[PDB]
Design a binder for this molecule. Structure first.
Ligand SMILES: [Ca+2]
Ligand SMILES: [Ca+2]
Ligand code: NA
Ligand code: NA
Ligand code: NA
Ligand code: NA
Ligand code: NA
Ligand code: NA
Lengths: 233, 233
C-alpha cells in the first residue's frame, strides 16, 4: 500500500519574493531527503529553457549537499527515472510539464519509482499539481494540450497552489469545478504552505493556512500542523 | 471566401461592473444584427445553470427587440444551429463550453452556419475564445477536458480576453505560449474592447486599448478604431 512506500513533499511556491529558490522549504527538504539520498533527479520540463533551469536547481541542491541530475540531459529519461534516488519536479507551466511527462513516457515510470519502490518525490507549484490526481485545478494557461489532464495520482485529491483570497475569484473558479460530476476535494495551498505525505499520513507545514474545498460543502480552513490524513484514505 | 460571408462581433466581457448585461456593447449589437435578424440562438454551455443563463440572456435580447432560443432547450441542437438566424455564445468556463460544443456536435455545424451560410456570430468572453483558432490563451481553469483545444476557427489568431496590465503576469503567461512552436498572434482585448469582423476586415471597437502579441516580437499596442484586418489574411 502507501504505508511504507509513499513519501511526498508538495510545495506550493518555489520562491518567496525576496527569498532564495527553495529557501522557505529547505529545512523540510533536508529532513525529507536525509543523507540516505545522494543525488536528486530533476524534471525541468515546465520551463522552456531547460538548461538554464537545471543549472539553477543544481546550484541550490548542491548547496544543500545533493548532486542534481536533470532528466533532459539523459539519453533515456525512463532509465534515469528507473535509477533515481529522489525526484524533484519544479514549477513552470503545468500543461507544458504534463504533456512532456506523457511525451517522454514518464507518467508510469515516475509512479512506479515513487509508489512502488519508495523513492521520495518533491514537487513545487506545477510539479505539485502533477503529483495529484489531475491538473484540473491548475492556475496556468493551456499553452499546449496534454493527452489527458490525469497526472501522477500520487494523491487522490486536487491541489490549487498559490491559493488566493478574494475575472472570477479563485474560490469562484474552484466552485465551478465542484459543479462538475464526482469531482474530488481541492486543497488550496497558499504561497507559504507545503504538504508532507508519509505513507497514509499527510501534514500541512509552513507558515500559511490552507483552504479545503469539498463538492457541495462550505470550505473548511486549516492551520499549519493540520492533519490532512483523511484526504488520503 | 470570408469576404461576403463572415460576420463576427467578439466581445471581451459581457458586463461592465455597475452596468447591465451587454450594455456597453448594445449599440454595436443593434448595428451588427439589424432588423434582418428576428431571433438569436444562444449557446449557454459555459455556465452550469443553463436554464437561469438562458432566462437572463433572453431578457436582454428581448429588450433589444430579438427573440432568444437556447440550444439547450432544443431536442436536436444541430438542427437548431441549422435553423439559426444568428448565434450568440456567452461567457462562463471556456473548457466547459468547448467540451460541450464537441459533445453536442456543434463545432462543424456552427462553423458551417457562420462561415458558409453567412449567419452573424456574437461571442462574449468564453464565447469569444471559442470563435478563435483554439482556446490556448483562455484565462479559465481546465475544469473538464475537451478532446482538443482547437475551436471554431472563425478567425485564425488567438484572443486573450480581459487582458490585464502588470503568479505569472498576463504578458508572462502569453510569452510562454509564444515560446511554443509556430504559435499564432495573440490579441489581448481589455475589458472594454470588442472586435468587429466583416469579411476580410477587422476593427477594434469600444473604449479600451488592445495589446497585440506576436511570436518573437515586442507587443504592439492599438487604439479603438484600429484596423486589425492584417490579422485575418
Ligand atoms: Ca498552478
Ligand atoms: Ca478567458
Ligand atoms: Na505554473
Ligand atoms: Na520506474
Ligand atoms: Na490538482
Ligand atoms: Na471565463
Ligand atoms: Na449548420
Ligand atoms: Na484564443
Amino acid at each position: 500500500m502507501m504505508t511504507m512506500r509513499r513519501h511526498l513533499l508538495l510545495v506550493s511556491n518555489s520562491t518567496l519574493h525576496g527569498g532564495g529558490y527553495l529557501e522557505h522549504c529547505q529545512e523540510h527538504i533536508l529532513k525529507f531527503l536525509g543523507a540516505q539520498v545522494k543525488r536528486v533527479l530533476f524534471i525541468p520540463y515546465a520551463l522552456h529553457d531547460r538548461d538554464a533551469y537545471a543549472k539553477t536547481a543544481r546550484q541550490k541542491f548542491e548547496a544543500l549537499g545533493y548532486g542534481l541530475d536533470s532528466v533532459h540531459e539523459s539519453p533515456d529519461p525512463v532509465d534515469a527515472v528507473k535509477k533515481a534516488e529522489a525526484i524533484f519536479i519544479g514549477g513552470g507551466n503545468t500543461f507544458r510539464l504534463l504533456k512532456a511527462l506523457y511525451d517522454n513516457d514518464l507518467i508510469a515510470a515516475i509512479r512506479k519509482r515513487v509508489l512502488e519502490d519508495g523513492v521520495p518525490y518533491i514537487g513545487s507549484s506545477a510539479g505539485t499539481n502533477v503529483a495529484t490526481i489531475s491538473i484540473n485545478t491548475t492556475n496556468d494557461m493551456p499553452i499546449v494540450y496534454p493527452p489527458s489532464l490525469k497526472a501522477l495520482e500520487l494523491v487522490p485529491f486536487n491541489i490549487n497552489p498559490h491559493y488566493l483570497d478574494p475575472g472570477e475569484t479563485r474560490e469562484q473558479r474552484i466552485t465551478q469545478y465542484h459543479e462538475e460530476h464526482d469531482t474530488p476535494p481541492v486543497l488550496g495551498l497558499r504561497e507559504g504552505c507545503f504538504l508532507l505525505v508519509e505513507g497514509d499520513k499527510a501534514t500541512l507545514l509552513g507558515i500559511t493556512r490552507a483552504r479545503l474545498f469539498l463538492r457541495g460543502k462550505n470550505p473548511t480552513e486549516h492551520e499549519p500542523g493540520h492533519d490532512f490524513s483523511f484526504l488520503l484514505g
